[PDB]
Structure formats: structure tokens, C-alpha cells
Amino acid sequence: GGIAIYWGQNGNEGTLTQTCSTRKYSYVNIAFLNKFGNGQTPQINLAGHCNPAAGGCTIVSNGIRSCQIQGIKVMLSLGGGIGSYTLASQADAKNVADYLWNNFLGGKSSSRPLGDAVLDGIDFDIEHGSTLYWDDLARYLSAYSKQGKKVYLTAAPQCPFPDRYLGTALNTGLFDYVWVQFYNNPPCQYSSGNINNIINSWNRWTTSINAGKIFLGLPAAPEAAGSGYVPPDVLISRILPEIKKSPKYGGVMLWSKFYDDKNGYSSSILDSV
């Protein structure tokens, strides 16, 4: 399989072009569109990379194209750990889907925040707020595929199954790739000496949902998460041989590009994935 990486939350982590040029990643999620819904004007947050005012982030289209040329799929990630994103109603789901289509996908807008490039899909990283309507948002985005170009749908649920925010949306069977977050959640993450909780949880996920491929999501450094970091050696020796047995195995997801650079996590695990 391949490695999915989150990029966008630390201005020092390198450009999107450099990120794709590493040749380590197969998927890149751009983190985050962290404000939308409830009549708010949607706002992308790419930390120090660029300021989206006055088309300050359109330069990112260069990186998007460069990734895609090399066969890397690039998603815009909604939500994240911080932000006032929500969906107020089913009409809000529709408004948000139309906004995303016109501003990031195959539609038209005079003010596309990341420029002219057409993203491959949308990543759902919904971690708080409303548990409602995410399934409608997935349906509406999925309908836009009928115009000719596939809109990929991906999700980052937390490991406790089922996920309170994304469970219904994942039950739709519309998601292409699901990278489960096996961290910040004691009952289903790695803890010193104990791999049972994580394998047990992986078995639940892979047997329970219909998506194309399921990925094992991890923090790339001890600093990247509150808890759940797994040393690469343990991953390679004890965890991967077990999880790679699943036909639904897609590879590994890492939070985030910035920490990966510092800790050299993907460099250490790349050939084992």
C-alpha cells in the first residue's frame, strides 16, 4: 500500500510541491477548511503557508498540479481539531457541497482560494460539532461525479467504532478511502507492550464498513498527538504483518508532514507499508 499525509498546518513543513516530490506519499490531504456552515463564509486555514486574502493562496495550485502529474491524489480536508465548522440543516449540507464544487472541484468561481487546479476529492475530518447531515454532504458531493470527473470521498474517523460524527456517512458506502485515527483514544490505540487494542479495533473497522481501502492512521512523532505514538520498529515488526493481511488494507496515514520531517517516520517505514 501507500502513505497518506496531512499537509498545511505548519508553514515550516515545506511547499506542497516539495512534499509531493519526496516520493514518499501517495495521497495528500490539505488541512484545513476549518470554518463553514451555519451561514459562515468558509475560510481555509493553512497556518503560515499563505494568507488566502487577495488570492494569496492560489500559488498552491502549482503544488496541486505537480502532485497530480506524479499520480498523487490531493484532497481538501474539512474540519480538524479546531474550528467552528458545523452543518445546521440539510439545506446547509447542500449549500456547502455547492460551495466546494465551485471553489475547489470542477465548478466555477471567481474567487477559488487555492487557484485554478481541480482537487481530486474531499476529506472529512469532523471531530466535534454537529453529528448530523454529514451523510447528506457526502451524497451531494458524490452526485457531482455524474458530470464526468470523479469526486473522491475520504474520511478520518477516530478509532472508537462506530464514530459519533462520521458513522452514518460511512454507512452510505460512498467513501473511497478511510484513514482511521488510532491515537488520542486509549481504548483503541497502541500502549506500551500492548498491541491488542489496536489490532482488535482494526478488525472491527475492516469488517464493518464498505469503503474501498482502509488505512492505519498514526502520529508521525510523539509530539504530534496527546497519546498513541508507535515506534517504527514496533509498527514494522508487530503491527504491519497483522494488518496487511486484510484485503481492505490500503496503507498508513500520518499526522502530519511537519512532524514526519522532524522524526523521519515515513523514511523508516516506507518499504514495509
Cα 235 from Cα 23, distance rounded (Å): 21
Burial tier of 268 (Cβ tally within 10 Å: 0-12, 13-18, 19+): middle
Give the number of domains in the chain.
1
Cα 156 from Cα 121, distance rounded (Å): 14
Strands 2-7 and 249-255: parallel
Burial tier of 258 (Cβ tally within 10 Å: 0-12, 13-18, 19+): buried
Could you tell me the resolution of this structure in angstroms? 1.8
**CATH number for position 187:** 3.20.20.80
Cα 230 from Cα 219, distance rounded (Å): 8
Cα 263 from Cα 267, distance rounded (Å): 9
Beta bridge partners of 152: 121
Domain that holds residue 219: 1-273
Cα 2 from Cα 18, distance rounded (Å): 18
Q: Answer yes or no: 127 catalytic.
A: yes
Technique used by the depositors: X-ray
Q: What is the DSSP letter of 113?
A: T
CB-based contact 21:271 (threshold 8 Å)? no
Within its chain, how far is the Cα of 73 from the centroid? 11
Please provide the DSSP assignment of 196-242 as one string. HHHHHHHHHHHHH---SEEEEEEESSGGGSSS----HHHIIIIIHHH
List the catalytic residue out of 13, 127, 223, 242.
Answer: 127
Beta strands of the chain (E only): which ranges? 2-7, 27-35, 43-44, 73-79, 121-125, 152-155, 177-181, 213-219, 249-255
Q: What is the DSSP letter of 88?
A: -
